[PDB]
Amino acid sequence: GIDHTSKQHKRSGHRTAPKSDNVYLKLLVKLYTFLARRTDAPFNKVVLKALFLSKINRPPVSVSRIARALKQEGAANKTVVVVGTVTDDARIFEFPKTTVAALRFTAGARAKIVKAGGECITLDQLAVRAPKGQNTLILRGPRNSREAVRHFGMGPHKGKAPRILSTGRKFERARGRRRSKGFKV
Amino acid sequence: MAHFKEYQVIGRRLPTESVPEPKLFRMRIFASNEVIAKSRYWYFLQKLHKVKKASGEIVSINQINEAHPTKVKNFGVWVRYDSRSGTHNMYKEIRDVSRVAAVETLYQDMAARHRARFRSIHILKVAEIEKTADVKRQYVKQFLTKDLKFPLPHRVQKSTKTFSYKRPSTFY
Amino acid sequence: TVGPHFKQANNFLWPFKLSNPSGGWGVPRKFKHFIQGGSFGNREEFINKLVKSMN
Amino acid sequence: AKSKNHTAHNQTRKAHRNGIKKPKTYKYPSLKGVDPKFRRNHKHALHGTAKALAAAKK
Amino acid sequence: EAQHKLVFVVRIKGINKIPPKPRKVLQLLRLTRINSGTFVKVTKATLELLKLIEPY
Amino acid sequence: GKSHGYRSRTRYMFQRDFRKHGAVHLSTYLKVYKVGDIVDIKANGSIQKGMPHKFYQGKTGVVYNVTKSSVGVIINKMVGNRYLEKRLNLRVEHIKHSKCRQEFLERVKANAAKRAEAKAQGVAVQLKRQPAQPRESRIVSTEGNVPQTLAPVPYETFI
RNA sequence: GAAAUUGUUGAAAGGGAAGGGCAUUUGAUCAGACA
RNA sequence: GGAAUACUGCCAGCUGGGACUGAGGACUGCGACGUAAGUCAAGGAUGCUGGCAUAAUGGUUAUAUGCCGCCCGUCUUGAAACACGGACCAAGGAGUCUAACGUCUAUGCGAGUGUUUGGGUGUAAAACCCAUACGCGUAAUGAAAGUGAACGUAGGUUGGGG
RNA sequence: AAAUAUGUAAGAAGUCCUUGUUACUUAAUUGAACGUGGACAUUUGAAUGAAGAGCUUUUAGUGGGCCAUUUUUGGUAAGCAGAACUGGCGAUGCGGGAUGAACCGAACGUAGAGUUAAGGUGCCGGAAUACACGCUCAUCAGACACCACAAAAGGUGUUAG
RNA sequence: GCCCUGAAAAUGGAUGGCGCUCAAGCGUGUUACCUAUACUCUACCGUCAGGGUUGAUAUGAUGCCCUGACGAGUAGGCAGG
RNA sequence: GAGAACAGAAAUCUCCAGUAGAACAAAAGGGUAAAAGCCCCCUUGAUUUUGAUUUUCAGUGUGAAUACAAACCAUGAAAGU
RNA sequence: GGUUGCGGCCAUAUCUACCAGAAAGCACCGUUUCCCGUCCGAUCAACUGUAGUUAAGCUGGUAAGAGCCUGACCGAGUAGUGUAGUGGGUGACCAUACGCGAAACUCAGGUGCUGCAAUCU
Ligand SMILES: [Mg+2]
Ligand SMILES: [Mg+2]
Ligand SMILES: [Mg+2]
Ligand SMILES: [Mg+2]
Ligand SMILES: [Mg+2]
Ligand SMILES: [Mg+2]
Ligand SMILES: [Mg+2]
Ligand SMILES: [Mg+2]
Ligand SMILES: [Mg+2]
Ligand SMILES: [Mg+2]
Ligand SMILES: [Mg+2]
Ligand SMILES: [Mg+2]
Ligand SMILES: [Mg+2]
Ligand SMILES: [Mg+2]
Ligand SMILES: [Mg+2]
Ligand SMILES: [Mg+2]
Ligand SMILES: [Mg+2]
Ligand SMILES: [Mg+2]
Ligand SMILES: [Mg+2]
Ligand SMILES: [Mg+2]
Ligand SMILES: [Mg+2]
Ligand SMILES: [Mg+2]
Ligand SMILES: [Mg+2]
Ligand SMILES: [Mg+2]
Ligand SMILES: [Mg+2]
Ligand SMILES: [Mg+2]
Ligand SMILES: [Mg+2]
Ligand SMILES: [Mg+2]
Ligand SMILES: [Mg+2]
Ligand SMILES: [Mg+2]
Ligand SMILES: [Mg+2]
Ligand SMILES: [Mg+2]
Ligand SMILES: [Mg+2]
Ligand SMILES: [Mg+2]
Ligand SMILES: [Mg+2]
Ligand SMILES: [Mg+2]
Ligand SMILES: [Mg+2]
Ligand SMILES: [Mg+2]
Ligand SMILES: [Mg+2]
Ligand SMILES: [Mg+2]
Ligand SMILES: [Mg+2]
Ligand SMILES: [Mg+2]
Ligand SMILES: [Mg+2]
Ligand SMILES: [Mg+2]
Ligand SMILES: [Mg+2]
Ligand SMILES: [Mg+2]
Ligand SMILES: [Mg+2]
Ligand SMILES: [Mg+2]
Ligand SMILES: [Mg+2]
Ligand SMILES: [Mg+2]
Ligand SMILES: [Mg+2]
Ligand SMILES: [Mg+2]
Ligand SMILES: [Mg+2]
Ligand SMILES: [Mg+2]
Ligand SMILES: [Mg+2]
Ligand SMILES: [Mg+2]
Ligand SMILES: [Mg+2]
Ligand SMILES: [Mg+2]
Ligand SMILES: [Mg+2]
Ligand SMILES: [Mg+2]
Ligand SMILES: [Mg+2]
Ligand SMILES: [Mg+2]
Ligand SMILES: [Mg+2]
Ligand SMILES: [Mg+2]
Ligand SMILES: [Mg+2]
């Protein structure tokens, strides 16, 4: 017998392939594992795993969040990579040029990129242009802006947003929510 | 505790800047190996001086061989031994060819007559009885008479097979 | 020699997996101390005859 | 029908499976509980040196 | 003789019914299995370890 | 029934140190504390205001704040399987500066010295601490010192 | 035209139950593989 | 005085009897022996000889023999229990569907999204098409009247993949 | 006034220099707090280990417990009742204690060879009717932990003091 | 110390049994010996992990090749069937 | 303890000794001597606002408590409280 | 070195009994118009530094002094204790193995150290 210092037969816990069944995503993976095996390049190993992430861990990157990252010093001629969909934002009135390599571009988003004379590229087109990922800027969407995380960690004095259907007063606003009725949280 | 050896064991009282070269005490110790003998040495020193193995040092460990291993000697022995109801000193006499052989059958005797396991006994002194008629115990004195002889009656021969065809004879 | 690099040297060695002793233990009960006629604790230079019978 | 009143038996085995996790250190702890008089002025002190380092890039 | 700086420890005792404190020392000395030995360099800070596990 | 009040069980814990009763000597209030100091907590029964709860007796913490008569201390108290952050508001009578870091502060400015005074000499440092090593060999003389042979003594009574 | 359960016939075992595990003797039966 | 010996320990000293195993399947390594060419016991068995070609070996089965083997299910700290149910066999026989939901996941589209109340249409309960709305989201906060989100590269600092 | 048990510390989130911000504070550019600029790398500051560390969400079963060594309360006591720390049983077979939930040994994939543990080796029954020194003779001897009980008090039985 | 007295219960009966007396009893020592699902070495199954491998012109890319460690289980969870 | 008419064991007066052997509502345990006890003087902070914190804890509530902030006040020569 | 004012540590500074103390200082000491307080100018308040005194305070020294402080292989490796065994014993209890280790006792030494400012044969 062995006095076991750690839980035996433990899985890595990290996704290995995508759980998705989309052949093309499977093909994109096939590409980037090869690239990640033979290029010793950090960008490809990161991109490989981003393809594995579920719709929750691929928040959309907006076209305006893109425009921002090019205003970083020396970042304006870099090609931005979004492993995930890219969405339009009517709130910026001036979008720069660039070249954006994503999984998907919404109708509105690809329009605004192209209207300014930019380029919408599929990830495989980006591998051909930059095998070692040269001159790339990877952007992730705001993961924790889901409505669900509002209710995570719910409890006394945590300020965490009840799970509720109908709202207004008369709904979970009185005893325990204010000093004049019972206590406050 | 086993077949015994005798050990000069010397240890002292670790040096201090204010008291370098401390005082060097020797003991003779009967043990089956040198690891017991050192444990045993420290067992008694903590019973006499203020020291423990942590604060002290063994300076040397040496086996002592019997001076005349083929000469029969009459030994008096001096023992302190705890019993069930209380502790008692003793003096026994042992006739044998080496101090180590002597200590062996002492411990055997204390176990058979007095039910004393090795932990209870202390050897106080073992020393050669020089002149005879300083032998004080009758079971040894029996063996010092001039021109001693005895038969070994009713001799029993160990048989090497399960059956015998003769019928034994205890003759001798 | 207990080198300057003993830590890295020794941790590099996987723990030795010895067999039970071949001549047995020499004791009727293992779980007293060596001095007490068992096998445990520091037995000093006698660790070699044991280990050799287990290697 | 009496029954066992209480014991801490088995409770430190449970505590040690996943845990006794060390306290979680942070550079920059909170000002929670800090003297308002101090903290009110401190709000301005920083705003002062922040305004400084801005006119240090001009 | 300069007291020994090097020691070889072999776990003599089986896996179970071991109190917690000696049991971690056994792990930190990498003796987690019976008759598995390792080398241990002797200092006060490993000497106290050898003290905790002597019965095993 | 049971009695669990705030000072329960604290009989000897808040007691005064024999022949040490009375006023607290004046140094206790001249000592000066800043945010970041490590302090030890020992409650003084003579000052009932600002008293630490008995759980924090004999506990070390880090002052997070400083007021007229008091310093706030934060303590990691472990409840269940985790630690939570408790912050305490203590009168200065219950708080002394901790020596727990002085061997570290001594050793930093010492390790800085033998660093400069070595490098400027051409290196060869060794400033990490080492445990007690086994001692070397030595030769003990017999000069004026012959071993004095001792034996076990017999049983006596003397009562 | 199953099963429980029954008759016949054939085989075998049976000193206060029977049935079961590992193993082999003996009897019966059978697959494969040589070329 | 000079040896021997025991005891303990070391030898990368030599050598005999016995047992189990023979995983792998071109080559590739580290070496060893040789003046050499070659050779080898060096990253896992080959060589030589014989017998049967069969119920011989092997499987199944019944029996005998050695050792072992308590009744299953259940509730229980604890059941083989002098706790319960169960004589036997077949066939039925127990986490379902719906309304509204939480976390996660897949998919479509994305500041939106949802054709299927309805209408159009049809090879007719399918498939295909669609106007107006409505729903949820895109604003919050107050009991309410109400008011309603850029000092600034949409901020400073510390860690931060790339 | 211990032993065991217990809080904190053992560096880059560190140390030293220069001298900015404020509405706090000072008699005071005094301080306090937060900074800009500068000096010193891994013997960068004890040991050992590290099949890595950190983090989030959701949900099962459970919420009768019982036993052993040690500490320990009530009770004459209890295979009784109630706490403490650990280890077990429950949920677990395997070797041993004949038998046995909890003891000893040791924790289980299917197998081969070897060595053992606890415990044993007259015969049952694998394994010395082995070696050695004593002791013991019982007209209800004795025979191995947990364990299946025996006491005061006695013996001119015998042994050694 | 061992032995004996002290020492009374109900079916017949238990050092486990037979039996054992310079023991096959009690104390103590020394060797040898026996045998666990444990230890050591090897084969094989599975689990987990680390590597390697999309170059056609044949057959598996959730694949193929190398290597290491691990394997008890009620209630219960998940997985592959 | 030693003293003073009625005055006695106990009345009021005085000196000496007095580490607290007293008192501080109440149970007990802490604590306290130019005080925290006794006498006197002045008062209403037992007030206003809304947060943090400690014990109990789920780190809910309640009870009780702590240390600040912002008032308005008390008292003291004042520091302060 | 003395003394004083303000101290820090808070008996090695306290307690008991005696002896000694130069110069300065402190003190005791004199007065009751005034502010102020008492049953009482004892305390307290003011005035004098004049009219007196080392008696007291205060400082120091003495004592096989009480106390207190410090130390030691004095006691004691004792008591207690962490760990171990299919250790002993009917039990109560005990011995051993690897560690940690007091208190009393006994003996020796000691009796305030010291910061700021002023002052003084
Ligand atoms: Mg919302
Ligand atoms: Mg939102
Ligand atoms: Mg041999
Ligand atoms: Mg053998
Ligand atoms: Mg045994
Ligand atoms: Mg071997
Ligand atoms: Mg009830
Ligand atoms: Mg009960
Ligand atoms: Mg309960
Ligand atoms: Mg090691
Ligand atoms: Mg109570
Ligand atoms: Mg409670
Ligand atoms: Mg109060
Ligand atoms: Mg029909
Ligand atoms: Mg069968
Ligand atoms: Mg055929
Ligand atoms: Mg055939
Ligand atoms: Mg051979
Ligand atoms: Mg092969
Ligand atoms: Mg055939
Ligand atoms: Mg056949
Ligand atoms: Mg055939
Ligand atoms: Mg048949
Ligand atoms: Mg059976
Ligand atoms: Mg029941
Ligand atoms: Mg029954
Ligand atoms: Mg029922
Ligand atoms: Mg029935
Ligand atoms: Mg059916
Ligand atoms: Mg129709
Ligand atoms: Mg149409
Ligand atoms: Mg219309
Ligand atoms: Mg709406
Ligand atoms: Mg509104
Ligand atoms: Mg610790
Ligand atoms: Mg390591
Ligand atoms: Mg790792
Ligand atoms: Mg639950
Ligand atoms: Mg529940
Ligand atoms: Mg309940
Ligand atoms: Mg146990
Ligand atoms: Mg249960
Ligand atoms: Mg279990
Ligand atoms: Mg088990
Ligand atoms: Mg039994
Ligand atoms: Mg058993
Ligand atoms: Mg044990
Ligand atoms: Mg039998
Ligand atoms: Mg046999
Ligand atoms: Mg016995
Ligand atoms: Mg016993
Ligand atoms: Mg007798
Ligand atoms: Mg027998
Ligand atoms: Mg015997
Ligand atoms: Mg096996
Ligand atoms: Mg399993
Ligand atoms: Mg399957
Ligand atoms: Mg309660
Ligand atoms: Mg209350
Ligand atoms: Mg004068
Ligand atoms: Mg005088
Ligand atoms: Mg004076
Ligand atoms: Mg004195
Ligand atoms: Mg015992
Ligand atoms: Mg004891």
PDB file of N, CA and C (backbone and C1' of nucleotides) in Angstrom, chain H residues 91-114:
ATOM      1  P     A H  91     -41.451 -14.645 -17.907  1.00  0.00           P
ATOM      2  O5'   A H  91     -42.801 -13.816 -17.882  1.00  0.00           O
ATOM      3  C5'   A H  91     -43.730 -13.939 -18.935  1.00  0.00           C
ATOM      4  C4'   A H  91     -45.003 -13.214 -18.616  1.00  0.00           C
ATOM      5  C3'   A H  91     -44.844 -11.828 -18.040  1.00  0.00           C
ATOM      6  O3'   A H  91     -44.475 -10.873 -19.015  1.00  0.00           O
ATOM      7  C1'   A H  91     -46.443 -13.000 -16.780  1.00  0.00           C
ATOM      8  P     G H  92     -43.879  -9.444 -18.585  1.00  0.00           P
ATOM      9  O5'   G H  92     -45.212  -8.628 -18.349  1.00  0.00           O
ATOM     10  C5'   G H  92     -45.188  -7.367 -17.725  1.00  0.00           C
ATOM     11  C4'   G H  92     -46.490  -7.057 -17.047  1.00  0.00           C
ATOM     12  C3'   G H  92     -46.351  -6.035 -15.944  1.00  0.00           C
ATOM     13  O3'   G H  92     -46.414  -4.719 -16.448  1.00  0.00           O
ATOM     14  C1'   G H  92     -47.402  -7.942 -15.077  1.00  0.00           C
ATOM     15  P     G H  93     -45.067  -3.861 -16.588  1.00  0.00           P
ATOM     16  O5'   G H  93     -44.807  -3.371 -15.106  1.00  0.00           O
ATOM     17  C5'   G H  93     -45.831  -2.685 -14.403  1.00  0.00           C
ATOM     18  C4'   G H  93     -45.649  -2.813 -12.922  1.00  0.00           C
ATOM     19  C3'   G H  93     -44.284  -2.411 -12.404  1.00  0.00           C
ATOM     20  O3'   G H  93     -44.138  -1.011 -12.221  1.00  0.00           O
ATOM     21  C1'   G H  93     -44.865  -4.509 -11.514  1.00  0.00           C
ATOM     22  P     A H  94     -44.024   0.012 -13.454  1.00  0.00           P
ATOM     23  O5'   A H  94     -43.146   1.202 -12.884  1.00  0.00           O
ATOM     24  C5'   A H  94     -43.757   2.336 -12.279  1.00  0.00           C
ATOM     25  C4'   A H  94     -43.036   2.765 -11.027  1.00  0.00           C
ATOM     26  C3'   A H  94     -41.522   2.803 -11.134  1.00  0.00           C
ATOM     27  O3'   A H  94     -41.076   4.024 -11.704  1.00  0.00           O
ATOM     28  C1'   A H  94     -42.155   1.639  -9.179  1.00  0.00           C
ATOM     29  P     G H  95     -39.523   4.322 -11.992  1.00  0.00           P
ATOM     30  O5'   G H  95     -39.398   5.871 -11.672  1.00  0.00           O
ATOM     31  C5'   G H  95     -40.338   6.798 -12.193  1.00  0.00           C
ATOM     32  C4'   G H  95     -39.864   8.215 -12.013  1.00  0.00           C
ATOM     33  C3'   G H  95     -38.488   8.534 -12.582  1.00  0.00           C
ATOM     34  O3'   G H  95     -38.493   9.904 -12.975  1.00  0.00           O
ATOM     35  C1'   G H  95     -38.494   9.012 -10.301  1.00  0.00           C
ATOM     36  P     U H  96     -38.028  10.356 -14.440  1.00  0.00           P
ATOM     37  O5'   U H  96     -39.392  10.449 -15.255  1.00  0.00           O
ATOM     38  C5'   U H  96     -39.786   9.402 -16.126  1.00  0.00           C
ATOM     39  C4'   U H  96     -41.277   9.383 -16.318  1.00  0.00           C
ATOM     40  C3'   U H  96     -41.901  10.667 -16.826  1.00  0.00           C
ATOM     41  O3'   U H  96     -41.764  10.828 -18.225  1.00  0.00           O
ATOM     42  C1'   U H  96     -43.182   9.815 -15.027  1.00  0.00           C
ATOM     43  P     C H  97     -40.962  12.094 -18.804  1.00  0.00           P
ATOM     44  O5'   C H  97     -42.094  13.061 -19.369  1.00  0.00           O
ATOM     45  C5'   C H  97     -43.091  12.574 -20.244  1.00  0.00           C
ATOM     46  C4'   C H  97     -44.400  13.250 -19.981  1.00  0.00           C
ATOM     47  C3'   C H  97     -44.335  14.758 -19.854  1.00  0.00           C
ATOM     48  O3'   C H  97     -44.300  15.421 -21.097  1.00  0.00           O
ATOM     49  C1'   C H  97     -45.546  13.892 -18.039  1.00  0.00           C
ATOM     50  P     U H  98     -43.513  16.808 -21.237  1.00  0.00           P
ATOM     51  O5'   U H  98     -44.490  17.839 -20.530  1.00  0.00           O
ATOM     52  C5'   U H  98     -45.813  18.019 -21.011  1.00  0.00           C
ATOM     53  C4'   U H  98     -46.639  18.852 -20.066  1.00  0.00           C
ATOM     54  C3'   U H  98     -46.056  20.200 -19.669  1.00  0.00           C
ATOM     55  O3'   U H  98     -46.281  21.208 -20.636  1.00  0.00           O
ATOM     56  C1'   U H  98     -46.814  19.070 -17.738  1.00  0.00           C
ATOM     57  P     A H  99     -45.275  22.450 -20.750  1.00  0.00           P
ATOM     58  O5'   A H  99     -45.663  23.379 -19.521  1.00  0.00           O
ATOM     59  C5'   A H  99     -46.914  24.047 -19.477  1.00  0.00           C
ATOM     60  C4'   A H  99     -47.018  24.923 -18.256  1.00  0.00           C
ATOM     61  C3'   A H  99     -45.821  25.822 -18.004  1.00  0.00           C
ATOM     62  O3'   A H  99     -45.869  27.008 -18.772  1.00  0.00           O
ATOM     63  C1'   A H  99     -46.364  24.691 -16.017  1.00  0.00           C
ATOM     64  P     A H 100     -44.528  27.608 -19.411  1.00  0.00           P
ATOM     65  O5'   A H 100     -43.757  28.197 -18.155  1.00  0.00           O
ATOM     66  C5'   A H 100     -44.373  29.175 -17.333  1.00  0.00           C
ATOM     67  C4'   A H 100     -43.596  29.407 -16.071  1.00  0.00           C
ATOM     68  C3'   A H 100     -42.098  29.513 -16.239  1.00  0.00           C
ATOM     69  O3'   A H 100     -41.673  30.775 -16.678  1.00  0.00           O
ATOM     70  C1'   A H 100     -42.579  28.079 -14.445  1.00  0.00           C
ATOM     71  P     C H 101     -40.191  30.935 -17.265  1.00  0.00           P
ATOM     72  O5'   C H 101     -39.295  30.883 -15.975  1.00  0.00           O
ATOM     73  C5'   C H 101     -38.411  29.809 -15.804  1.00  0.00           C
ATOM     74  C4'   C H 101     -37.848  29.790 -14.424  1.00  0.00           C
ATOM     75  C3'   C H 101     -36.364  29.491 -14.415  1.00  0.00           C
ATOM     76  O3'   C H 101     -35.612  30.676 -14.479  1.00  0.00           O
ATOM     77  C1'   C H 101     -37.477  27.942 -13.028  1.00  0.00           C
ATOM     78  P     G H 102     -34.071  30.632 -14.905  1.00  0.00           P
ATOM     79  O5'   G H 102     -33.359  29.936 -13.658  1.00  0.00           O
ATOM     80  C5'   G H 102     -33.015  30.685 -12.508  1.00  0.00           C
ATOM     81  C4'   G H 102     -31.901  30.017 -11.752  1.00  0.00           C
ATOM     82  C3'   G H 102     -30.649  29.702 -12.549  1.00  0.00           C
ATOM     83  O3'   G H 102     -29.792  30.811 -12.671  1.00  0.00           O
ATOM     84  C1'   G H 102     -31.264  27.817 -11.274  1.00  0.00           C
ATOM     85  P     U H 103     -28.703  30.849 -13.843  1.00  0.00           P
ATOM     86  O5'   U H 103     -27.730  29.634 -13.526  1.00  0.00           O
ATOM     87  C5'   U H 103     -26.707  29.782 -12.557  1.00  0.00           C
ATOM     88  C4'   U H 103     -25.859  28.544 -12.473  1.00  0.00           C
ATOM     89  C3'   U H 103     -25.153  28.145 -13.757  1.00  0.00           C
ATOM     90  O3'   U H 103     -23.943  28.835 -13.966  1.00  0.00           O
ATOM     91  C1'   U H 103     -26.223  26.261 -12.835  1.00  0.00           C
ATOM     92  P     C H 104     -23.518  29.203 -15.459  1.00  0.00           P
ATOM     93  O5'   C H 104     -23.195  27.798 -16.138  1.00  0.00           O
ATOM     94  C5'   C H 104     -22.156  26.967 -15.654  1.00  0.00           C
ATOM     95  C4'   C H 104     -22.218  25.595 -16.280  1.00  0.00           C
ATOM     96  C3'   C H 104     -22.114  25.527 -17.793  1.00  0.00           C
ATOM     97  O3'   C H 104     -20.789  25.633 -18.264  1.00  0.00           O
ATOM     98  C1'   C H 104     -23.869  24.138 -17.073  1.00  0.00           C
ATOM     99  P     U H 105     -20.517  26.333 -19.674  1.00  0.00           P
ATOM    100  O5'   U H 105     -21.048  25.275 -20.720  1.00  0.00           O
ATOM    101  C5'   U H 105     -20.491  23.980 -20.772  1.00  0.00           C
ATOM    102  C4'   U H 105     -21.259  23.109 -21.721  1.00  0.00           C
ATOM    103  C3'   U H 105     -21.485  23.694 -23.092  1.00  0.00           C
ATOM    104  O3'   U H 105     -20.333  23.653 -23.907  1.00  0.00           O
ATOM    105  C1'   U H 105     -23.490  22.755 -22.320  1.00  0.00           C
ATOM    106  P     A H 106     -20.243  24.595 -25.201  1.00  0.00           P
ATOM    107  O5'   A H 106     -21.289  23.938 -26.203  1.00  0.00           O
ATOM    108  C5'   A H 106     -20.979  22.742 -26.894  1.00  0.00           C
ATOM    109  C4'   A H 106     -22.094  22.382 -27.831  1.00  0.00           C
ATOM    110  C3'   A H 106     -22.487  23.458 -28.822  1.00  0.00           C
ATOM    111  O3'   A H 106     -21.624  23.532 -29.938  1.00  0.00           O
ATOM    112  C1'   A H 106     -24.420  22.646 -27.785  1.00  0.00           C
ATOM    113  P     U H 107     -21.317  24.957 -30.609  1.00  0.00           P
ATOM    114  O5'   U H 107     -22.671  25.268 -31.384  1.00  0.00           O
ATOM    115  C5'   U H 107     -23.181  24.367 -32.352  1.00  0.00           C
ATOM    116  C4'   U H 107     -24.559  24.780 -32.781  1.00  0.00           C
ATOM    117  C3'   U H 107     -24.708  26.230 -33.197  1.00  0.00           C
ATOM    118  O3'   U H 107     -24.225  26.505 -34.493  1.00  0.00           O
ATOM    119  C1'   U H 107     -26.446  25.679 -31.722  1.00  0.00           C
ATOM    120  P     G H 108     -23.681  27.970 -34.851  1.00  0.00           P
ATOM    121  O5'   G H 108     -25.005  28.812 -35.119  1.00  0.00           O
ATOM    122  C5'   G H 108     -25.880  28.446 -36.170  1.00  0.00           C
ATOM    123  C4'   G H 108     -27.167  29.224 -36.128  1.00  0.00           C
ATOM    124  C3'   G H 108     -27.043  30.739 -36.148  1.00  0.00           C
ATOM    125  O3'   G H 108     -26.788  31.257 -37.442  1.00  0.00           O
ATOM    126  C1'   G H 108     -28.574  30.114 -34.477  1.00  0.00           C
ATOM    127  P     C H 109     -25.530  32.222 -37.698  1.00  0.00           P
ATOM    128  O5'   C H 109     -26.034  33.624 -37.150  1.00  0.00           O
ATOM    129  C5'   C H 109     -27.140  34.248 -37.773  1.00  0.00           C
ATOM    130  C4'   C H 109     -27.857  35.195 -36.852  1.00  0.00           C
ATOM    131  C3'   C H 109     -27.056  36.324 -36.228  1.00  0.00           C
ATOM    132  O3'   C H 109     -26.772  37.394 -37.112  1.00  0.00           O
ATOM    133  C1'   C H 109     -28.392  35.344 -34.584  1.00  0.00           C
ATOM    134  P     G H 110     -25.535  38.393 -36.844  1.00  0.00           P
ATOM    135  O5'   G H 110     -25.820  39.014 -35.410  1.00  0.00           O
ATOM    136  C5'   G H 110     -26.823  39.997 -35.235  1.00  0.00           C
ATOM    137  C4'   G H 110     -26.954  40.416 -33.794  1.00  0.00           C
ATOM    138  C3'   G H 110     -25.803  41.228 -33.222  1.00  0.00           C
ATOM    139  O3'   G H 110     -25.943  42.601 -33.558  1.00  0.00           O
ATOM    140  C1'   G H 110     -26.379  39.485 -31.711  1.00  0.00           C
ATOM    141  P     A H 111     -24.711  43.639 -33.526  1.00  0.00           P
ATOM    142  O5'   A H 111     -24.936  44.479 -32.184  1.00  0.00           O
ATOM    143  C5'   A H 111     -25.642  45.721 -32.178  1.00  0.00           C
ATOM    144  C4'   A H 111     -27.049  45.574 -31.642  1.00  0.00           C
ATOM    145  C3'   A H 111     -27.771  46.871 -31.247  1.00  0.00           C
ATOM    146  O3'   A H 111     -29.169  46.738 -31.513  1.00  0.00           O
ATOM    147  C1'   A H 111     -27.758  45.409 -29.429  1.00  0.00           C
ATOM    148  P     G H 112     -29.717  46.769 -33.013  1.00  0.00           P
ATOM    149  O5'   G H 112     -29.345  45.332 -33.572  1.00  0.00           O
ATOM    150  C5'   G H 112     -30.277  44.264 -33.516  1.00  0.00           C
ATOM    151  C4'   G H 112     -29.912  43.235 -32.470  1.00  0.00           C
ATOM    152  C3'   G H 112     -30.723  41.948 -32.530  1.00  0.00           C
ATOM    153  O3'   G H 112     -30.143  40.997 -33.396  1.00  0.00           O
ATOM    154  C1'   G H 112     -30.817  42.812 -30.344  1.00  0.00           C
ATOM    155  P     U H 113     -31.056  40.229 -34.455  1.00  0.00           P
ATOM    156  O5'   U H 113     -31.681  38.992 -33.667  1.00  0.00           O
ATOM    157  C5'   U H 113     -30.918  38.200 -32.766  1.00  0.00           C
ATOM    158  C4'   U H 113     -31.811  37.588 -31.720  1.00  0.00           C
ATOM    159  C3'   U H 113     -33.070  36.926 -32.257  1.00  0.00           C
ATOM    160  O3'   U H 113     -32.856  35.580 -32.648  1.00  0.00           O
ATOM    161  C1'   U H 113     -33.629  38.391 -30.482  1.00  0.00           C
ATOM    162  P     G H 114     -33.733  34.937 -33.825  1.00  0.00           P
ATOM    163  O5'   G H 114     -35.145  34.654 -33.165  1.00  0.00           O
ATOM    164  C5'   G H 114     -35.320  33.628 -32.212  1.00  0.00           C
ATOM    165  C4'   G H 114     -36.712  33.672 -31.651  1.00  0.00           C
ATOM    166  C3'   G H 114     -37.846  33.816 -32.645  1.00  0.00           C
ATOM    167  O3'   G H 114     -38.162  32.627 -33.343  1.00  0.00           O
ATOM    168  C1'   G H 114     -38.213  35.250 -30.826  1.00  0.00           C
TER     169        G H 114
END
